[PDB]
Design an enzyme around this catalytic site. Structure first.
Site, mmCIF file in Angstrom:
data_model
loop_
_atom_site.group_PDB
_atom_site.id
_atom_site.type_symbol
_atom_site.label_atom_id
_atom_site.label_comp_id
_atom_site.label_asym_id
_atom_site.label_seq_id
_atom_site.Cartn_x
_atom_site.Cartn_y
_atom_site.Cartn_z
ATOM 1 N N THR A 275 0.830 -1.208 0.000
ATOM 2 C CA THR A 275 0.000 0.000 0.000
ATOM 3 C C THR A 275 0.864 1.257 0.000
ATOM 4 O O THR A 275 2.046 1.209 0.338
ATOM 5 C CB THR A 275 -0.954 0.057 1.216
ATOM 6 O OG1 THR A 275 -0.199 0.149 2.430
ATOM 7 C CG2 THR A 275 -1.853 -1.172 1.270
ATOM 8 N N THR A 276 0.263 2.383 -0.375
ATOM 9 C CA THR A 276 0.995 3.639 -0.508
ATOM 10 C C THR A 276 1.278 4.262 0.860
ATOM 11 O O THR A 276 0.409 4.286 1.734
ATOM 12 C CB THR A 276 0.226 4.653 -1.384
ATOM 13 O OG1 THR A 276 -0.228 4.008 -2.582
ATOM 14 C CG2 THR A 276 1.116 5.838 -1.758
#
Ligand SMILES: [Cl-]
Ligand SMILES: [Mg+2]
Ligand SMILES: [Mg+2]
Lengths: 241, 111, 244, 235, 240, 250, 231, 195, 243
Positions: free
Chosen positions: I30-31
């Site tokens: 995930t970012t």
């Protein structure tokens, strides 16, 4: 073909992992240069900050190992810092044990011996770096000693490292063929830095701004790096003659 | 020189009935001629219908009780919540005490 | 991990052989022949140096015959460097025994100790075995004159006459033919040299290509003398026996 | 090569699964649990007639209230038995009481997965651990090299296991007597064994609360074999 | 330390290293054990490929573990020395801590335990050796004969053989050895042991070694001439 | 982490060859030529200073090394391997001898210690053999002058004269014709320079050649006076000028 | 393929196959359900037998008076990890006179499992765990995977056919979270949830295993005729 | 324990050792044998601190018996005595030394000579014609100095030994409850049951 | 070939393929981002809501080291936790010996050397995380990002994970449009926006925003989580910008 994966001999008597560590050396695409003056030793290196999001002040391949010894690295930064930390620890231990500051050539030999062990012991890989140590030694004077992944080391009148090392090397060779001396006959370190930059410009064929270079200077009893504004003053003097 | 032992005073008393048992002890804790506490419990419910008191050097007494209570906990875990009989508890405590045969828990213990 | 690169030096083949021991024996079969012959009044050790040069300093050289103590000597066939590791261990064991019991170590006890060390490298540790075969020549007051051999497997056996190294098949046949039980040292010396002279891969057998030693009770009264032959002395015994 | 503690794509430990194949080659061992006791029986399977069969010890005492039968690479079982005996007696030292059958079995199974690169491989032997304690009564456990143990009313292990287990499926009920269980083990052993069953190539044992763990004499078993033959000929 | 697991299971449930160790035993010289009514005899083959041997000093095939127990073997010679040494140490260690000499069954159980340990320990290979352990328990006149093998299993035998061509001599013993009436005397026991080896040995000269063990620490090794007399008598009866 | 390579990396092949030792000898063959000649009153060892770059100061790189005051060494093969062997050889001369007997070891025993170290790299776990062959020249009171060769296997042989590396086959033939048992040290130096010229391509002078001798005691190089029995080191490295002087009489 | 021989090897797409194979062992394991309200937390587990003569393998393990878990996969690995939790819960009590927080218990399990995924020689744990507990911040439910990932949830399920029970809980989310001060109704919701993962077989008296912990309820396990009430 | 004597005559070695064992103020036993057979022709008597004596003796016995089995050969008395000395010299610098003094009487079958070795707890070995440990020598050596010849028979050796014990019994304050006497010669080891 | 099967093996290129494969695990995650502001730093992360059964605001991803350093990472979450545990040991021993809290550049090298050590041997696997971290020390604010190779640099803005390109573009705009600098409260708002904009690369599942910050003025140089009204204010600002 597992003789190419670990540091054992091939049928030709070669160590392929050592040879491939030499190739990792040029992964950064940076060229470095070192020369000696009368009272000083100067080292310059290309600085490339490709990303705008980077803090340019933290991007460096020159290290202050001890008060007297400086080190520039050609190779990836993780291995560079690994070598830097070890050299700092070794230099400090030496002073504690033997009561005097570790000489540049002795540190080079020590780091070269450590590199040799990685070429002989299987579980340890070579570091993909070339280490150039500089100082003004209290016995030998201005000193340049360079170490590589093979565990080889030697002293230099001047030297160059990187993808375009040969062009810089020949350029320096030709100058010392004219002057017929083992150093730059110059009083101040400022002018020795100017010489180093000028001859890198001529050899590479590229102009430099203040942020394109990185400079380290060794004098008696201290090694220091130049700021961007110190380099700018150096670049102005070159252009004005 | 450092003396690792001390004397916290106190007195305890155990009496076995036909279908019951009592374990009593005074609540006074002392060093030398001073009173530390007028109410510092010395007799403890350790679980499985067992009561215990380690009298003498309070620090060693608290440590032993703490370890035995722990020994009861792990007896349940390891042996399918089986009830620790009083005879089995007694034998377990002998081994807790002899672990320090050469640096003893300075306490007189009753369960 | 590291497992990938492990040769596994201490395993059986499907046939029940130890790979590395067998290959070490193959190495030894290319080494210079060494011969031992036991007589009633002494023991002979003869050995062939491998293709030498004229510029090799022979009188200070030692590649085949080594002294373990005053009573026991060994002839080597295989890797010299490996043999020296074992030789120094054997020299220490002999001195340990002498310090403990105040008596010189019996020959077999020394041999068993070295053979047990070799055995260890075939069963545990994951290291390659020693590429060495020894001929032990020695004397003690229990069994008198004794010849033993040990190989990389750590197995050892006693002999009246024996060869190790190159051409042992041919050499053993020749020894089996001419050997007799009532034989003496001077005769055994002649047999050893004659056997080497016929089994050698060289064109001719000369003094500079040989190491020679005897263990004799030919020492003044009830005691034993070790004689490591000098180059000139090997040259003389070659003329005496009629080979050169 | 490959790791000793490696998982297969199906989520099983290769070495544990391979050790189970070695146990399938082992001689048959059967256990039956009743309210009057637990019976343990084994096939001796002598490799030659010159082998003195009474030296074949595939049924073993762990404590007075716990017995054990084995199948597979029986040499591997010796250290397991040694640990079991030590655990049983050590608990008696620490707690002045008999140790629970389950707790003993759990102690043995804790060794099972202590292998890697500790021992170099799993055990190549399965154990039927039978016993009695005051809390859970007469019990029979099957201890595998996976570290898993199941309790069983009746269980067969070894080369004739699936054939014997199907037979134990039909025959077992909660009201079996000890005598009935004895004959039932003999019956099923005789069915799956290669050679003809007698007192010399098969062995019986039991564990009762009163007398504890007992290995049966060859004379005692011989009578139970003769009693079996007659009752099968009775219909 | 070197921890590599050399003895491991294969898909079909076999430990190949242990099974290949049995092949080393198959290669070894033949050894035979026969127990009579009041004795045990251990016979051993000596391969005659090796002449010019010094039989005084050459390691004998039968080894005393204590004054009342002996051990012979088939397989790797160097491996056997390690088991014998460990056994001898354990024998003195038992006398020292329990004040009784080892029983033959106990000594066997120890040696077999050592062999087993080398089948599930890291960095080691199994012993390429099977042993025959014989003797008499202290203050007991019942003969004892046990066998061990690389896997670590052991068992008691009325008579047994191990090593090369052991299949043939076991065949001989199975039809010739009667359990109801075992060799009553020493002569009968030795004769049956020599006969069994003559099925395999080749020449009956220096190829057969015999060692008789009687109760109360009475152990002796027969000489060449004594054995040769058995060899002579057997074949003279055979010519009929 | 932990060094998990506890097994041998050098093993016997079916043919009986130890591959890694053979391959190490191949690395030695590629290396620059070095030689040694023994005279009646001394020993000489020599090699070419093959400079990797003209900017490099080849004086800082020492191919010929002092091990003890009376023992010197030169190599052919991998330089870094040689450097660490010299460090270990110097130390073992003290730890396993001088600190025990109060004197420096004789040539043959120091060689024996170096040989042992190289043998262990051929058998120990997780290491390759050293990729060098050493020539060790030395003097001691009871053995006199001596010259030894040491190979990657750990084997060592005494020589009257020999050569190792690139052009060793040709150089050994050249030495066989010129060597005799009556040579004086100066004659041996002369022969060493002649032999070495054949294997060198480029410049041939005092700055490109490294040469040392084991000869007479040098009291001028001792560093102190006052003890009659201490007469100075027999090992001496010839200067650039001293070499060039002998190249005019060549 | 070539990158699944050991746990120390990434695949070219950055996957750890030995960990994924360990995850596969959980999917083969019998179903178990976890769910909680604000006052109580419940574990429900379908036990598996070898055959009709055999017992039903126990799925739930107690760690402390206020904490416990249910397992799915290699049972011995659950014994090792639960033993570790027992010790950590116990260290917290003896040293700090403090009941171990459920969240911190999850962090400790994560870190223990992780060490087995980065080192040579070892192997990942082959079991998944559902930890329930009641501490100073109320009721909690955790899901442990042997990759190291630990997740705090309102409800979940692991094992074979666990997707059915997980969907049910995802629908019932708003209902069962509100079941405060009613242990029996919370268990009912758990039993109804695990029923969505059944095929062919149904919940019998020696098949079903239930555990509960709450505000004034120590961690207790129910087996045998004690769960007949909920069948 | 208390008194151990030794005398080497023409063709044998004779060892005499007290029978008493005392705990506190009470004599627990008056028939204790303070000796161990190391090999068929080698006997070792011992005296020193309680417990250590038997332990050490049995440990030596086990080592010599192990050697005998391994080599199928009996070590010479000299070899055994040197092994024992080393074990004691090793012991004296240990954390807790073994406080044991020994006499080793053996018959060397090779040389056909009896041999007596005296070794104290420090590892001090001496070969002697006659020897003793502790205070025993203070009373007995004057008699032995006077009466001893090297050509004495075994019977004469026993008579001289009786005189030594009588002197000990007269002038020692401690009651050592008589002695057990053992003879070591070519035929092996035997005990004199009446003394 | 076979050079990619073992860690610490140089390919003929001079590359360590095992480290490059660890990067693929980071790119899969995930970012997460970091923003350097006037007197401090702001960290933000995307948390994918896999299911409704996830308890909101409970599965905390951002971790504190000492009391003045914040750490966030993308990739294999357990590997990140392991790295932070080491970081906490390093920070503790530094403070134990030298009294002062560990400076950010000093701390960065401690992690760097440790991660680099896991590229030296085949007996260990490289880290499957890129770590963004930083805080305030005596010399002011510092932001760092550390890759699986052990490589790290100082940053004005930093981003990693599946939506790193989108994030980087947004960070570059802020650097250009604010040469004089960005405030701490502004950086929190911008951090929210960037995570929301970077969520287009993970648009299948909805997500939960998590932000933290160290600021000399706003938090007294201590690491704190953005909570309640200030978090909601940032979410509203972020939601307004995407529409
Ligand atoms: Cl060094
Ligand atoms: Mg390496
Ligand atoms: Mg004395």
């Amino acid at each position: 073909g597992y003789d190419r994966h670990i540091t054992i001999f091939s049928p030709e008597g070669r160590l392929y992992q050592v040879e491939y560590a030499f190739k990792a050396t040029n992964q950064t695409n940076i060229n470095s240069l070192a020369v000696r003056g009368k009272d000083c030793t100067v080292v310059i290196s290309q600085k490339k900050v490709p990303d705008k999001l980077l803090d340019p002040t933290t991007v460096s391949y020159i290290f202050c190992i001890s008060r007297t010894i400086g080190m520039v690295v050609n190779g990836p930064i993780p291995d560079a810092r690994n070598a830097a930390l070890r050299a700092k620890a070794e230099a400090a231990e030496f002073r504690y044990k033997y009561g005097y500051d570790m000489p540049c050539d002795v540190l080079a030999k020590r780091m070269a011996n450590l590199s040799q062990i990685y070429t002989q012991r299987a579980y340890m890989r070579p570091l993909g770096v070339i280490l150039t140590f500089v100082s003004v030694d209290e016995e030998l004077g201005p000193s340049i000693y360079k170490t590589d992944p093979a565990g080889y080391y030697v002293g230099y009148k001047a030297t160059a490292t990187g993808p375009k090392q040969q062009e810089i090397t020949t350029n320096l060779e030709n100058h010392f063929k004219k002057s017929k001396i083992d150093h730059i006959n110059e009083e101040s370190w400022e002018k020795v830095v100017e010489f180093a930059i000028t001859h890198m410009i001529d050899a590479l064929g590229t102009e430099f701004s203040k942020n394109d270079l990185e400079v380290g200077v060794a004098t008696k009893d201290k090694f220091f790096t130049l700021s961007a504004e110190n380099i700018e003053e150096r670049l102005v003097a070159i252009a004005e003659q | 020189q450092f003396n690792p032992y001390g004397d916290n005073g106190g007195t305890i008393l155990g009496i076995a009935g036909e279908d019951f048992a009592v374990l009593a002890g005074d609540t006074r804790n002392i060093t030398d001629y001073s009173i530390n506490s007028r109410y510092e419990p010395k007799v403890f419910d350790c679980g499985d219908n067992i009561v215990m008191s380690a009298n003498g050097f309070a620090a060693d007494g608290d440590a032993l009780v703490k370890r035995f209570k722990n020994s009861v906990k792990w007896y349940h875990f390891d042996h399918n919540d089986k009830k620790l009989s009083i005879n089995s508890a007694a034998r377990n405590i002998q081994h807790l005490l002899y672990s320090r045969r050469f640096f003893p828990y300075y306490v007189y213990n009753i369960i | 991990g590291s497992r990938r690169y492990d040769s596994r030096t201490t395993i059986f083949s499907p046939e029940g052989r130890l790979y590395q021991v067998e290959y070490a024996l193959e190495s030894i079969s290319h080494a210079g022949t060494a011969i031992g012959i036991m007589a009633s009044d002494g023991i002979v050790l003869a050995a062939e140096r491998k293709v030498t040069s004229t510029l090799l300093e022979q009188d200070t050289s030692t590649e085949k015959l080594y002294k373990l103590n005053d009573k026991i000597a060994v002839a080597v066939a295989g890797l010299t460097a490996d043999a020296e590791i074992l030789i120094n261990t054997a020299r220490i064991h002999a001195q340990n025994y002498l310090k403990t019991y105040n008596e010189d170590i019996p020959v077999e006890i020394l041999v068993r100790r070295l053979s047990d060390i070799k055995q260890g490298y075939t069963q545990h540790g994951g290291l390659r075995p020693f590429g060495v075969s020894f001929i032990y020549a020695g004397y003690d007051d229990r069994y008198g004159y004794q010849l033993y051999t040990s190989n990389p497997s750590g197995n050892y056996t006693g002999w009246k006459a024996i060869s190790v190294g190159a051409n042992t098949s041919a050499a053993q046949t020749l020894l089996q033919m001419d050997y007799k039980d009532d034989m003496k040292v001077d005769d055994a010396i002649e047999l050893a040299l004659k056997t080497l002279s016929k089994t050698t891969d060289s064109s001719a057998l000369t003094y500079d290509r040989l190491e020679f030693a005897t263990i004799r009770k030919g020492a003044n009264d009830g005691e034993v003398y070790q004689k490591i032959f000098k180059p000139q002395e090997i040259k003389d015994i070659l003329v005496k026996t009629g080979i050169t | 090569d490959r790791g000793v503690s490696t998982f297969s794509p199906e989520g099983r430990l290769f070495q544990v699964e391979y050790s189970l194949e070695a146990i399938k080659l082992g001689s048959t061992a059967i256990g039956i649990a009743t309210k009057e006791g637990v019976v343990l029986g084994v096939e001796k399977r002598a490799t030659s007639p010159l082998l003195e069969s009474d030296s074949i010890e595939k049924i073993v005492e762990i404590d007075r209230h716990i017995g054990c039968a084995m199948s597979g690479l029986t040499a591997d079982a010796r250290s397991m038995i040694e640990h079991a005996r030590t655990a049983a007696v050590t608990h008696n030292l620490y707690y002045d009481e008999d140790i629970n059958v389950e707790s003993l079995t759990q102690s043995v199974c804790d060794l099972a997965l202590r292998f890697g690169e500790l021992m170099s491989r799993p055990f190549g032997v399965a154990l039927l651990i039978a016993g009695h304690d005051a809390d859970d009564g007469y019990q029979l456990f099957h201890a595998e090299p996976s570290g898993t143990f199941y309790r069983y009313n009746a269980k067969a292990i070894g080369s004739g296991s699936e054939g014997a287990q199907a037979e134990l499926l039909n025959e077992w009920h909660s009201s079996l007597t000890l005598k009935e269980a004895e004959l039932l083990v003999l019956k099923i052993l005789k069915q799956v064994m290669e050679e003809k069953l007698d007192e010399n190539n098969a062995q019986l044992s039991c564990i009762t609360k009163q007398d504890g763990f007992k290995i049966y004499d060859n004379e005692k078993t011989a009578e139970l074999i003769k009693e079996l033959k007659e009752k099968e000929a009775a219909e | 330390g070197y921890d590599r697991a050399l003895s491991i299971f294969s898909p079909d449930g076999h430990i190949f290293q242990v099974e290949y160790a049995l092949e080393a035993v198959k290669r070894g010289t033949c050894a035979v054990g026969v127990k009579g009514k009041n004795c045990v005899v251990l016979g051993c083959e000596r391969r005659s490929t090796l002449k010019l041997q010094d039989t005084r000093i050459t390691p004998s095939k039968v080894s005393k573990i204590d004054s009342h127990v002996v051990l012979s073997f088939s397989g790797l010679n160097a491996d056997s020395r390690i088991l014998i040494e460990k056994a001898r140490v354990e024998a003195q260690s038992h006398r020292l801590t329990l004040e009784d000499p080892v029983t033959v069954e106990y000594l066997t159980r120890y040696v077999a335990g050592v062999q087993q340990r080398y089948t599930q320990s890291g960095g080691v290979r199994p012993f390429g050796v099977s042993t025959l352990i014989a003797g008499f328990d202290p203050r007991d006149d019942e003969p004892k004969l046990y066998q061990t093998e690389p896997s670590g299993i052991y068992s008691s035998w009325s008579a047994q053989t191990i090593g090369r061509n052991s299949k043939t001599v076991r065949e001989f013993l199975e039809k010739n050895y009667d359990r109801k009436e075992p060799p009553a005397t020493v002569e009968e026991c030795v004769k049956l042991t020599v006969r069994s080896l003559l099925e395999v040995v080749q020449t009956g000269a220096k190829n057969i070694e015999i060692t008789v063990v009687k109760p109360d620490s009475d152990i002796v090794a027969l000489s060449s001439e004594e054995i040769n007399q058995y060899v002579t008598q057997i074949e003279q009866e055979k010519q009929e | 982490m932990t060094d998990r390579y506890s097994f041998s990396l050098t093993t016997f092949s079916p043919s009986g060859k130890l591959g890694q030792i053979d391959y190490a000898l191949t690395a030695v063959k590629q290396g620059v030529t070095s030689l040694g000649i023994k005279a009646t009153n001394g020993v000489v060892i020599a090699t070419e200073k093959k400079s990797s770059s003209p900017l490099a100061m080849s004086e800082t790189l020492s191919k010929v090394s002092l091990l003890t005051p009376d023992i010197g060494a030169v190599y052919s093969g991998m330089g870094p391997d040689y450097r660490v062997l010299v460090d270990k050889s110097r130390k073992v001369a003290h730890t396993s001898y001088k600190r025990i007997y109060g004197e420096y070891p004789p040539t043959k025993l120091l060689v024996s210690e170096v040989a042992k170290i190289m043998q262990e790299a051929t058998q120990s776990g997780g290491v390759r053999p050293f990729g060098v062959s050493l020539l060790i020249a030395g003097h001691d009171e009871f053995n006199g002058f001596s010259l030894y060769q040491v190979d990657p296997s750990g084997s060592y042989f005494p020589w009257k004269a020999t050569a190792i590396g690139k052009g060793s086959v040709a150089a050994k033939t050249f030495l066989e014709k010129r060597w005799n048992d009556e040579l004086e040290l100066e004659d041996a130096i002369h022969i060493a320079l002649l032999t070495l010229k054949e294997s060198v391509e480029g410049e041939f002078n005092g700055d490109t050649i490294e040469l040392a001798i084991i000869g007479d005691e040098n009291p001028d190089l001792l560093g102190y006076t006052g003890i009659p029995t201490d007469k100075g080191p027999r090992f001496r490295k010839l200067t650039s000028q001293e070499i060039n002087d002998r190249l005019e009489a060549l | 393929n070539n990158y699944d021989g050991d746990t120390v090897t990434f695949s070219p797409t950055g996957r750890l196959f030995q960990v994924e194979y360990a995850l596969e062992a959980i999917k083969q394991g019998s179903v178990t359900v976890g769910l909680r309200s604000n006052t109580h937390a419940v574990l429900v587990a379908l036990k598996r037998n070898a055959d009709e003569l055999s017992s039903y393998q126990k799925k739930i393990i107690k760690c402390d008076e206020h904490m416990g878990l249910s397992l799915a996969g290699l049972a011995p690995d659950a014994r090792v990890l639960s033993n570790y939790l027992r010790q950590q819960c116990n260290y917290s009590s003896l040293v700090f006179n403090r009941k171990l927080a459920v969240e911190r218990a999850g962090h400790l399990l994560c870190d223990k499992a992780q060490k087995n995924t980065q080192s040579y020689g070892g192997r990942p744990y082959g079991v998944g765990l559902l930890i329930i507990g009641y501490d100073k911040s109320g009721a909690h439910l955790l899901e442990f995977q042997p990759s190291g990932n630990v997740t705090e949830l309102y409800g979940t399920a692991i094992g074979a056919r666990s997707q059915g029970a997980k969907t049910y809980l995802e629908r019932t989310l708003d209902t069962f979270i509100k079941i405060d001060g009613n242990p029996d109704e919370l268990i009912k919701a758990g039993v109804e949830a695990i029923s969505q993962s059944l095929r062919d077989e149904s919940l019998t008296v020696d098949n079903l295993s239930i555990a509960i912990v709450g505000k004034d309820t120590p961690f207790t396990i129910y087996d045998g005729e004690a769960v007949a009430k909920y069948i | 324990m208390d008194i151990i004597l030794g005398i080497r005559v023409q063709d044998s070695v004779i060892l005499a050792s007290s029978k008493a064992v005392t705990r506190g103020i009470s004599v627990l036993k008056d028939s204790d044998d303070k000796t161990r057979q190391l090999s068929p022709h080698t006997l070792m008597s011992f005296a020193g601190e309680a417990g250590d004596t038997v332990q050490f003796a049995e440990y030596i016995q086990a080592n010599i018996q192990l050697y005998s089995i391994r080599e199928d050969y009996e070590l010479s008395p000299q070899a055994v005595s040197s092994f024992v000395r080393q074990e004691l010299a090793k012991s004296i610098r240990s954390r807790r030394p073994y406080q044991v003094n020994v006499l080793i009487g053996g018959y060397d079958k090779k040389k056909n000579k009896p041999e007596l070795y005296q070794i104290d707890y420090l590892g001090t070995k001496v070969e002697l014609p006659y020897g003793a440990h502790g205070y025993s020598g203070f009373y007995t050596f004057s008699l032995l100095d006077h009466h001893y010849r090297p050509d004495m028979t075994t019977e004469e050796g026993l008579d001289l030994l009786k005189l030594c014990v009588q002197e000990l019994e007269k002038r020692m304050p401690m009651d050592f409850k008589g002695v057990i006497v053992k003879i070591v010669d070519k035929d092996g080891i035997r005990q004199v049951d009446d003394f | 070939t076979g050079y990619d099967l073992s860690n610490s093996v140089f390919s003929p290129d001079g590359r360590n393929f095992q480290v490059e494969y660890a990067v693929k695990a980071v790119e899969n995650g995930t970012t997460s981002i970091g923003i350097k502001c006037n007197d401090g730093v702001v960290f933000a992360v995307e948390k994918l809501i896999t299911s409704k059964l996830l308890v909101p605001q409970k599965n905390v991803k951002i971790q504190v080291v000492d009391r003045h350093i914040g750490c966030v990472y993308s990739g294999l979450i357990p590997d990140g936790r392991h790295l932070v545990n080491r970081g906490r040991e390093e920070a503790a021993s530094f403070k134990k010996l030298y009294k002062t809290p560990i400076p950010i550049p000093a701390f960065a090298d401690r992690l760097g050397q440790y991660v680099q050590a896991h590229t030296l041997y085949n007996s260990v696997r490289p880290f499957g995380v890129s770590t963004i971290f930083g805080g305030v020390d005596k010399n002011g604010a510092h932001l760092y990002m550390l890759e699986p190779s052990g490589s790290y640099w100082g940053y004005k803005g930093a981003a990693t994970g599946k939506g790193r390109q989108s994030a980087k573009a947004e960070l570059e705009k802020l650097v250009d449009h604010h040469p004089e600098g960005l405030s701490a409260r502004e950086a929190v708002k911008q951090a929210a926006k960037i995570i929301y904009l970077a969520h287009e690369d993970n648009k299948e599942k909805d997500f939960e925003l998590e932000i933290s910050w160290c600021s000399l003025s706003e938090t007294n140089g201590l690491h704190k989580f953005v909570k309640g009204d200030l978090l909601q204010e940032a979410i509203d600002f972020a939601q307004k910008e995407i529409n």
